[PDB]
Amino acid sequence: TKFSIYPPIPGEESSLRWAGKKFEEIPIAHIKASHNNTQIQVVSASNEPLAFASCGTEGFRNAKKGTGIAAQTAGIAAAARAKQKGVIHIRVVVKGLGPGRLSAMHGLIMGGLEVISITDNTPIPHXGCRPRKARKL
Amino acid sequence: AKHLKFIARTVMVQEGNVESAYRTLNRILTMDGLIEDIKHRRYYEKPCRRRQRESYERCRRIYNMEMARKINFLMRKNRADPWQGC
Amino acid sequence: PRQRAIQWGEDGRPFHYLFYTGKQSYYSLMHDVYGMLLNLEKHQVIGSR
Amino acid sequence: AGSRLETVGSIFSRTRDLVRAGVLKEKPLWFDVYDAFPPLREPVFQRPRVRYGKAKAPIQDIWYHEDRIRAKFYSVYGSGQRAFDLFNPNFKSTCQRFVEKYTELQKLGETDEEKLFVETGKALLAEGVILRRVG
Amino acid sequence: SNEDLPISMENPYKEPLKKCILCGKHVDYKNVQLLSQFVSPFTGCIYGRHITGLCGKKQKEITKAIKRAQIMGFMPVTYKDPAYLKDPKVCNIRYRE
Amino acid sequence: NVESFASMLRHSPLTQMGPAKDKLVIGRIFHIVENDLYIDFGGKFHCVCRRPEVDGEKYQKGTRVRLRLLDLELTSRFLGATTDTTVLEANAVLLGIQES
RNA sequence: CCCCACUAUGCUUAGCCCUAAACCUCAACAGUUAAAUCAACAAAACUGCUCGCCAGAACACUACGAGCCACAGCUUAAAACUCAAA
Ligand code: FES
Ligand SMILES: [K+]
Ligand SMILES: [Mg+2]
Ligand SMILES: [Mg+2]
Ligand SMILES: [Mg+2]
Ligand SMILES: [Mg+2]
Ligand SMILES: [Mg+2]
Ligand SMILES: [Mg+2]
Ligand SMILES: [Mg+2]
Numbered sequence: 151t152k153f154s155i156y157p158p159i160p161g162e163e164s165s166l167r168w169a170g171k172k173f174e175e176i177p178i179a180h181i182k183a184s185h186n187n188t189q190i191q192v193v194s195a196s197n198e199p200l201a202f203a204s205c206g207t208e209g210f211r212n213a214k215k216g217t218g219i220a221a222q223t224a225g226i227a228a229a230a231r232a233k234q235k236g237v238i239h240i241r242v243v244v245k246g247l248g249p250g251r252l253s254a255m256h257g258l259i260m261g262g263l264e265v266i267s268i269t270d271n272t273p274i275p276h277x278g279c280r281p282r283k284a285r286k287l
Numbered sequence: 288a289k290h291l292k293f294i295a296r297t298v299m300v301q302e303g304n305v306e307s308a309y310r311t312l313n314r315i316l317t318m319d320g321l322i323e324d325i326k327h328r329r330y331y332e333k334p335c336r337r338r339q340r341e342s343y344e345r346c347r348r349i350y351n352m353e354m355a356r357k358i359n360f361l362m363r364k365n366r367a368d369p370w371q372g373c
Numbered sequence: 374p375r376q377r378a379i380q381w382g383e384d385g386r387p388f389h390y391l392f393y394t395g396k397q398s399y400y401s402l403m404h405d406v407y408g409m410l411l412n413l414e415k416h417q418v419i420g421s422r
Numbered sequence: 423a424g425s426r427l428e429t430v431g432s433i434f435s436r437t438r439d440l441v442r443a444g445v446l447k448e449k450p451l452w453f454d455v456y457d458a459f460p461p462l463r464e465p466v467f468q469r470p471r472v473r474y475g476k477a478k479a480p481i482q483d484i485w486y487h488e489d490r491i492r493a494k495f496y497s498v499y500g501s502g503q504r505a506f507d508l509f510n511p512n513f514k515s516t517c518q519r520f521v522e523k524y525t526e527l528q529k530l531g532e533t534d535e536e537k538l539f540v541e542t543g544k545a546l547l548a549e550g551v552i553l554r555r556v557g
Numbered sequence: 558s559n560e561d562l563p564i565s566m567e568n569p570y571k572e573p574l575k576k577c578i579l580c581g582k583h584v585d586y587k588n589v590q591l592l593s594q595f596v597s598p599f600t601g602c603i604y605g606r607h608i609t610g611l612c613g614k615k616q617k618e619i620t621k622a623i624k625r626a627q628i629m630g631f632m633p634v635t636y637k638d639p640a641y642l643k644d645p646k647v648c649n650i651r652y653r654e
Numbered sequence: 655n656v657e658s659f660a661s662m663l664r665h666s667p668l669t670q671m672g673p674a675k676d677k678l679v680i681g682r683i684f685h686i687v688e689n690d691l692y693i694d695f696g697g698k699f700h701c702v703c704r705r706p707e708v709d710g711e712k713y714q715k716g717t718r719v720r721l722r723l724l725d726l727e728l729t730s731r732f733l734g735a736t737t738d739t740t741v742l743e744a745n746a747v748l749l750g751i752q753e754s
Numbered sequence: 755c756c757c758c759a760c761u762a763u764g765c766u767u768a769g770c771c772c773u774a775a776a777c778c779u780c781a782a783c784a785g786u787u788a789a790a791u792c793a794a795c796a797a798a799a800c801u802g803c804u805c806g807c808c809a810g811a812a813c814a815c816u817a818c819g820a821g822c823c824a825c826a827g828c829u830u831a832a833a834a835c836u837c838a839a840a
Contacts, residue, residue: 153299153301154299155298155299155301155308155311155653155654156297156299156598156639156642157293157294157297157299159294159639160291173293241293243293247322247325247326252309255305255309259305264303265300265303265305265308266299266300267293267297267298267299267300267308268297268298268300268305268308268309268312269292269293269295269296269297269298270296270297270312270316270321271295271296272321272325274321274324274325274328275328276634280331280764281328281329281330281331282330282331283330283331284330284331284332285330285755285756286755286756287755287756290633290634290635290636291633291636294636294639295599295600295601295635295636296599296600296636297599298599307654311652311653311654314652315599315600315652316599316600318650318652319597319599319600319602320602321600321602350733353732353733356730356732357732357739360728360730360732360739360741361739361741363728363741363743364741364743366687366690366702367687367688367690368687369685369687369690369692372403372406372407372410373403373407414686414715469790469791471787471788471789471791471798471799472736472787472791472798473787474786474787474798474799475785475786475787476785476786476787477786477787477788482563482565483563483568484563484663484669485563485564485565485566485568485569486563486564486664486669487564489566489569489570489672490566490569492569492570492670492672493569493570493672496570496672501676501677501678502678503678504678505678505679505680505720505752506667506671506677506678506679506680506696507667507679507680507696508667508668508671508679508680508695508696508697509680509682509696510667511666511667513667515667515670515671517670517672518670559658559660561658561660561661561663561664561665562660563660570672570673
């Protein structure tokens with residue numbers, strides 16, 4: 151069968167499997183890539199936390215937290231704690247356009263996890279709160 | 288918040304190629320205007336400023352499309368010189 | 374220095390049909406070469422610089 | 423002595439006037455010919471202006487009665503697979519052959535349009551013409 | 558005067574004006590299958606007329622139909638309903654790889 | 655009994671053809687530049703068609719060919735222009751050679 | 755100016771206040787594309803008709819007077835001295 155980039159829809163009968171687990175059963179790696187930090191939490195399909203890592207928890211401080219190499223290190227740390235709990239395949243849900251948006255995903259892979267999907271959940275208000283005033287620079 | 292999850296803005300990875308999956312996702316969000324939208328929303332653009340930029344963007348697109356059409360039309364005669372020497 | 378001869382007679386009529394180009398000798402040469410290229414179509418290094 | 427005011431009158435008027443004033447001692451070689459055989463319009467500079475509002479060019483579209491028959495024939499049967507030969511001044515296309523038959527049958531008193539068109543196709547088929555309907 | 562002179566009339570060879578794919582068809586807010594053909598699969602974003610090819614009138618009817626269907630409980634907002642992903646692709650947009 | 659211009663125009667093949675879009679016409683190659691064939695087909699302007707890949711050597715000066723016409727004159731009006739820009743050539747598609 | 759916090763305020767209701775680069779910096783209505791196209795730039799050039807408005811700069815979105823739910827307010831709006839420019 152040809153490859154579909156559209157994820158399998160829950161309730162329908164798909165043939166895709168990962169270690170005998172369906173798409174709905176794969177754990178989720180939640181990456182929050184902020185402008186000055188990157189936070190990564192791996193949770194189970196039942197919303198059980200399995201691992202948490204951020205650039206700040208990896209010994210980065212101030213402007214060093216807002217770097218790609220800092221996020222990559224945070225991903226490796228979360229991957230290590232998650233792999234010990236039995237996680238191999240993960241669904242990536244990244245919210246935010248920070249510098250650790252892509253680098254945080256690399257660390258998860260270098261840490262031994264297999265990414266089967268990528269989901270963007272960056273909050274976009276549809277009309278929402280007024281953002282802070284522009285900066286004069 | 289109330290919608291189903293892992294349908295919107297979701298791309299499946301093929302053969303472990305996560306780089307190509309991320310590029311496809313980024314291309315999707317770019318074409319739909321979400322990337323530019325998120326960036327413009329970090330600081331409040333004032334209504335007089337938004338109208339000025341929207342007017343500039345709409346006029347620049349028209350001018351660029353009209354300049355492309357002229358070059359396409361006037362490139363038909365880019366063929367070799369038929370009357371060289373005259 | 375070699376001097377170009379008169380380019381018209383007493384009546385004022387130029388001798389060469391390309392006089393009013395100002396480059397009659399150059400354009401007469403281009404005219405002769407362009408004509409030869411046409412006739413060929415109708416019909417069909419080391420030691421020199 | 424002369425005048426290079428090409429936007430003031432014409433070469434004839436400017437030359438004629440300077441001859442009268444004695445500015446030009448002799449008439450140019452062309453003056454006597456222009457006088458005897460003048461152009462239809464005196465060549466006077468004019469600045470082409472753009473039309474605005476309710477001003478429109480007087481040029482009219484060229485149409486003929488048979489053009490209505492040609493539009494229907496192309497719609498019904500399309501362009502003939504036979505190729506136009508626009509070099510032959512007496513070339514007749516399948517549409518022109520159709521138009522001539524359609525005109526002949528109209529002169530025989532028939533006045534209906536839908537009926538005058540179906541009978542014309544039959545006549546050509548009898549003569550051996552290929553009429554493949556587009557749809 | 559002369560029989561061969563041109564005659565005044567309307568262009569007989571004039572071609573009909575173009576029509577959008579939805580010209581002459583009723584656009585209902587309950588027809589989510591139709592409405593879904595004009596939103597982005599990944600983001601649910603309504604496509605501009607330069608992508609849908611619709612005219613101004615049908616672009617407006619489609620937009621108002623989508624907005625009505627979304628808030629009345631017939632159509633999702635943030636994504637195209639996956640049931641309608643295999644419908645005819647009438648929009649001039651290329652996404653995947 | 656001298657034929658008038660209005661009569662010549664009414665019965666001319668170019669007038670009888672109607673619109674030129676999607677009309678088959680016979681052209682004649684009069685000038686060739688590498689693989690660019692200049693073809694006259696009875697209109698005001700010639701068309702320029704690239705030598706076909708198949709039987710390219712059969713296309714020579716004087717060879718009569720079949721064309722599918724698109725426009726008798728390629729012209730367009732561009733923004734900020736009072737008149738139309740013309741490339742002084744017709745638009746046509748070369749189909750092949752005409753043979754008896 | 756840059757970073758953080760927070761208030762009047764932005765919102766609703768009921769009253770006021772009546773100001774904007776309230777600007778297409780294009781008064782309304784009607785008509786014209788022929789003249790000369792037209793100082794320049796803007797936004798092609800004009801005609802009929804009507805209302806409003808203007809008459810060197812600055813003083814002056816000021817003083818006084820008057821009216822106004824306005825009371826550090828708004829509208830209307832000078833003069834003296836000063837200059838040869840603006
Ligand atoms: S073109 Fe007719 S309704 Fe769209
Ligand atoms: K303005
Ligand atoms: Mg507050
Ligand atoms: Mg305003
Ligand atoms: Mg008024
Ligand atoms: Mg004054
Ligand atoms: Mg004020
Ligand atoms: Mg005051
Ligand atoms: Mg007072």
